[PDB]
């Protein structure tokens, strides 16, 4: 519907792609005033100025961030930190936040898709996807959230990095 | 001469190792406030350690 | 319609101009019981007894303010400090408050248009404009507020003096 259209419109300019040996292997996001890219994917960002600045890298949270140049600041993402019970949109079908966990239906994310955001009902990004592990007919995700100030990480057992 | 050189080298290596490790400790403590979208370090910790 | 008429009705009574070399270089406002103006603008206030009184200047917050003459107290401005998020009025059009930041569309403020107050939905003043930094199709403003009893100051990166 129209919500899918608006998600498409926001992802058309808020998400960039990384390149490695002629293959697409990850996506980077522009949240608030920070450009974020997960550390487990190696490559060069397909852009003329994003790759030209220093990156603060941490392997504990498996991510790297930088300060967004002011000449493209407007393409923000309107961050949020509330995490109530329920359903949340995604590029590859709706996911559900229940019991402090993110679950998606079985096979919806292929390896190499790491780096998509997870939007809320109002269009605000709440987490960035890192990996997933399947049980039964569902897949529990492994993401990082932005509660208060600390960027905590949650990972279920047997996860695989995409 | 040998004893003085050895003592000086040991003192320098101890000082360098401890200073580098203190710098690493500061960097690791202040690293997760710099990845959060928005937000800012508390002024207390911002004056205790040099915070950008 | 009527909101615009009421806004200009207040503005033509409270907002004063400052002259220099025969050209307009800024506007000085009147809020509550104080006459306030930005410090970067240099000129002569377009009134007789307003300039005849002694100001009080600070460069940390970048402004000057002084007491209200008794017989102009009737023309007030009805200040307030409540600061929710959404839309806000302004003589050059609507301004969006989000993420603790005020933002205007593309290019709507020429240099030398500083000092214009930002009114609220109920017609009360919330901040005095000082500068702005342009980006993409929007522009982040830099103003001064009145949080509780302290006048604070927020200037986005790359702010251009107005």
From Swiss-Prot, chains A, C:
It is found in: Virion; Host cytoplasm; Host cell membrane; Host nucleus. Residues 1-14 are annotated as: Ribosome-binding. It comes from the Viruses. Residues 56-61 are annotated as: Interaction with spike glycoprotein E2. Disulfide bonds join 14-29. Residues 84-94, 120-124 are annotated as: Dimerization of the capsid protein. Residues 14-162 form the Peptidase S3 domain. The record marks 88, 121 as: Involved in dimerization of the capsid protein. Changing residue 162 to A/R: Complete loss of cleavage by capsid protease. The active site is at 40 (charge relay system), 62 (charge relay system), 114 (charge relay system). Homodimer. Homomultimer. Interacts with host karyopherin KPNA4; this interaction allows the nuclear import of the viral capsid protein. Interacts with spike glycoprotein E2. Interacts with host IRAK1; the interaction leads to inhibition of IRAK1-dependent signaling. The N-terminus contains a nuclear localization signal and a CRM1-mediated nuclear export signal. The C-terminus functions as a protease during translation to cleave itself from the translating structural polyprotein. Forms an icosahedral capsid with a T=4 symmetry composed of 240 copies of the capsid protein surrounded by a lipid membrane through which penetrate 80 spikes composed of trimers of E1-E2 heterodimers. The capsid protein binds to the viral RNA genome at a site adjacent to a ribosome binding site for viral genome translation following genome release. Possesses a protease activity that results in its autocatalytic cleavage from the nascent structural protein. This is Capsid protein. The lineage of its organism: Viruses, Riboviria, Orthornavirae, Kitrinoviricota, Alsuviricetes. The chain holds residues 106 to 267 of 1253 of the full protein.
